[PDB]
Design a protein around this motif. Structure first.
Motif, mmCIF file in Angstrom:
data_model
loop_
_atom_site.group_PDB
_atom_site.id
_atom_site.type_symbol
_atom_site.label_atom_id
_atom_site.label_comp_id
_atom_site.label_asym_id
_atom_site.label_seq_id
_atom_site.Cartn_x
_atom_site.Cartn_y
_atom_site.Cartn_z
ATOM 1 N N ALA A 61 45.729 41.684 37.246
ATOM 2 C CA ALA A 61 46.235 40.955 38.435
ATOM 3 C C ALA A 61 45.713 41.805 39.681
ATOM 4 O O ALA A 61 46.113 41.642 40.864
ATOM 5 N N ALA A 62 44.548 42.703 39.369
ATOM 6 C CA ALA A 62 43.774 43.321 40.404
ATOM 7 C C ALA A 62 42.285 43.601 40.121
ATOM 8 O O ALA A 62 41.569 44.410 40.172
ATOM 9 N N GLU A 63 41.928 42.373 39.806
ATOM 10 C CA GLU A 63 40.409 42.372 39.222
ATOM 11 C C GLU A 63 39.755 42.358 40.373
ATOM 12 O O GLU A 63 39.642 41.818 41.625
ATOM 13 N N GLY A 64 38.826 43.395 40.494
ATOM 14 C CA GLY A 64 37.690 43.755 41.579
ATOM 15 C C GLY A 64 36.944 44.700 41.525
ATOM 16 O O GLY A 64 37.253 45.556 40.649
ATOM 17 N N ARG A 65 36.026 44.894 42.590
ATOM 18 C CA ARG A 65 34.963 46.290 42.623
ATOM 19 C C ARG A 65 35.544 47.247 43.642
ATOM 20 O O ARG A 65 34.634 47.985 43.835
ATOM 21 N N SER A 66 36.842 47.349 43.962
ATOM 22 C CA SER A 66 37.105 48.391 45.087
ATOM 23 C C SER A 66 38.149 49.356 44.517
ATOM 24 O O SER A 66 38.657 49.188 43.455
ATOM 25 N N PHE A 67 38.524 50.431 45.186
ATOM 26 C CA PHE A 67 39.512 51.451 44.879
ATOM 27 C C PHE A 67 41.078 50.978 44.655
ATOM 28 O O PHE A 67 41.958 51.673 44.302
ATOM 29 N N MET A 68 41.149 49.949 44.996
ATOM 30 C CA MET A 68 42.528 49.187 45.070
ATOM 31 C C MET A 68 42.443 48.135 44.056
ATOM 32 O O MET A 68 43.358 47.194 43.848
ATOM 33 N N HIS A 69 41.614 48.071 42.907
ATOM 34 C CA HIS A 69 41.329 46.798 42.192
ATOM 35 C C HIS A 69 40.793 47.634 40.869
ATOM 36 O O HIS A 69 40.347 49.085 40.775
ATOM 37 N N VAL A 70 40.800 46.960 39.815
ATOM 38 C CA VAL A 70 40.356 47.310 38.417
ATOM 39 C C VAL A 70 39.258 46.510 37.911
ATOM 40 O O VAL A 70 39.240 45.272 37.802
ATOM 41 N N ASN A 71 37.934 47.007 37.857
ATOM 42 C CA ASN A 71 36.727 46.393 37.617
ATOM 43 C C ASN A 71 36.364 46.369 36.087
ATOM 44 O O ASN A 71 35.582 46.610 35.457
ATOM 45 N N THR A 72 37.450 45.057 35.454
ATOM 46 C CA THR A 72 37.022 44.850 34.046
ATOM 47 C C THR A 72 37.106 43.272 34.084
ATOM 48 O O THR A 72 37.058 42.685 35.029
ATOM 49 N N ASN A 73 36.644 42.836 33.019
ATOM 50 C CA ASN A 73 36.288 41.267 32.840
ATOM 51 C C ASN A 73 36.442 41.066 31.201
ATOM 52 O O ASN A 73 36.858 41.933 30.557
ATOM 53 N N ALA A 74 36.443 39.819 30.816
ATOM 54 C CA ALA A 74 36.525 39.310 29.532
ATOM 55 C C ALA A 74 35.568 39.881 28.625
ATOM 56 O O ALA A 74 36.097 40.303 27.570
ATOM 57 N N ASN A 75 34.483 40.333 29.211
ATOM 58 C CA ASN A 75 33.394 41.104 28.478
ATOM 59 C C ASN A 75 34.042 42.474 28.014
ATOM 60 O O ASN A 75 33.204 42.932 27.071
ATOM 61 N N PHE A 76 34.470 42.979 28.896
ATOM 62 C CA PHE A 76 34.816 44.395 28.647
ATOM 63 C C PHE A 76 36.081 44.266 27.342
ATOM 64 O O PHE A 76 35.876 45.143 26.406
ATOM 65 N N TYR A 77 36.657 43.208 27.189
ATOM 66 C CA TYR A 77 37.447 43.038 26.085
ATOM 67 C C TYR A 77 37.238 42.163 24.638
ATOM 68 O O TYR A 77 37.409 42.202 23.918
ATOM 69 N N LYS A 78 35.931 41.618 24.864
ATOM 70 C CA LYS A 78 35.163 41.064 23.794
ATOM 71 C C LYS A 78 34.749 41.948 22.884
ATOM 72 O O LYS A 78 34.508 43.165 23.107
ATOM 73 N N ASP A 79 35.213 41.345 21.462
ATOM 74 C CA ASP A 79 34.869 42.079 20.183
ATOM 75 C C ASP A 79 36.117 42.976 19.925
ATOM 76 O O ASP A 79 36.153 43.582 18.581
ATOM 77 N N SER A 80 37.176 43.095 20.473
ATOM 78 C CA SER A 80 38.414 43.934 20.346
ATOM 79 C C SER A 80 39.272 42.968 20.145
ATOM 80 O O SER A 80 40.479 43.137 19.556
ATOM 81 N N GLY A 81 38.974 41.614 20.137
ATOM 82 C CA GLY A 81 39.931 40.606 19.741
ATOM 83 C C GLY A 81 41.128 40.243 20.773
ATOM 84 O O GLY A 81 42.098 39.617 20.618
ATOM 85 N N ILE A 82 41.042 40.991 22.176
ATOM 86 C CA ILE A 82 42.076 40.791 22.983
ATOM 87 C C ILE A 82 41.784 39.555 24.010
ATOM 88 O O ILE A 82 40.310 39.554 24.242
ATOM 89 N N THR A 83 42.411 38.897 24.284
ATOM 90 C CA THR A 83 42.412 37.719 25.289
ATOM 91 C C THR A 83 42.544 38.101 26.632
ATOM 92 O O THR A 83 43.862 38.747 27.059
ATOM 93 N N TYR A 84 41.759 37.582 27.588
ATOM 94 C CA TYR A 84 41.763 38.170 29.018
ATOM 95 C C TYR A 84 41.721 36.925 30.072
ATOM 96 O O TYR A 84 41.011 36.158 30.028
ATOM 97 N N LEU A 85 42.765 37.366 31.201
ATOM 98 C CA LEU A 85 42.591 36.338 32.466
ATOM 99 C C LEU A 85 42.694 37.574 33.457
ATOM 100 O O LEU A 85 43.520 38.221 33.435
ATOM 101 N N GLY A 86 42.000 37.038 34.498
ATOM 102 C CA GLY A 86 41.799 37.977 35.619
ATOM 103 C C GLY A 86 42.182 37.381 37.066
ATOM 104 O O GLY A 86 41.635 36.196 37.011
ATOM 105 N N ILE A 87 42.717 37.786 37.989
ATOM 106 C CA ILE A 87 43.149 37.284 39.129
ATOM 107 C C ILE A 87 42.881 38.337 40.150
ATOM 108 O O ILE A 87 42.955 39.340 40.039
#
Length: 178
Positions: A55-81
């Motif tokens: 719930a803090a997807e983004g490129r700043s110091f108040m956000h966490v810069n992750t995406n579905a790609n970061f979790y691909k191959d680990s079998g984890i399902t991702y949704l970013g807001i």
């Protein structure tokens, strides 16, 4: 009333404690955490997390810069807001989509979901509270109290007001359990 909600979060007035741990299971199979637990894939697996809602997807110091790609191959399902922790950000527009994502993880008996933001203090706890109101028919006061007992939280007044509007909608239409 937002002030009656802040009263449940503080020790009387003025002071709001900060998370004593980086992650907490606030209700069965629903975890609330911060930026570093979200980025520790080996810890997520150990815990058996199947879905991650950022719930803090983004490129700043108040956000966490992750995406579905970061979790691909680990079998984890991702949704970013891409939410901002401000009183003007309309997080309510994302309540339904978030409540749906959590319901899809929990629909399978093995599912476990991590709803996180930068600190796991304002943005993500708000989505979990909303889910408890919309899917488990708890009122705002009861939903807020349950999460708070398991993790030190402090949603901003604008997020609390959106939760209060939601509470009124649901209860007007007879959807909250007493």
């Amino acid at each position: 009333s937002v002030q009656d909600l802040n009263d449940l979060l503080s020790d009387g007035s003025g002071c709001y404690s900060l998370p004593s741990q980086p992650c907490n299971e606030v209700t069965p199979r629903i975890y609330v955490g911060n930026a570093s637990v979200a980025q520790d894939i080996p810890k997520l697996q150990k815990l058996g997390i199947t879905h991650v809602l950022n719930a803090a997807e983004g490129r700043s110091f108040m956000h966490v810069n992750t995406n579905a790609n970061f979790y691909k191959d680990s079998g984890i399902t991702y949704l970013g807001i891409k939410a901002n922790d401000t009183q003007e950000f309309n997080l309510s527009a994302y309540f339904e989509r978030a409540a749906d994502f959590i319901d899809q993880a929990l629909a399978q008996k093995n599912g476990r979901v991590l709803v996180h933001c930068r600190e796991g203090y304002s943005r993500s706890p708000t989505l979990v509270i909303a889910y408890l109101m919309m899917r488990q028919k708890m009122d705002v006061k009861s939903a807020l109290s349950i999460v708070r007992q398991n993790r030190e939280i402090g949603p901003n007044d604008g997020f609390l007001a959106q939760l209060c509007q939601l509470n009124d909608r649901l209860a007007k239409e007879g959807k909250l359990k007493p």
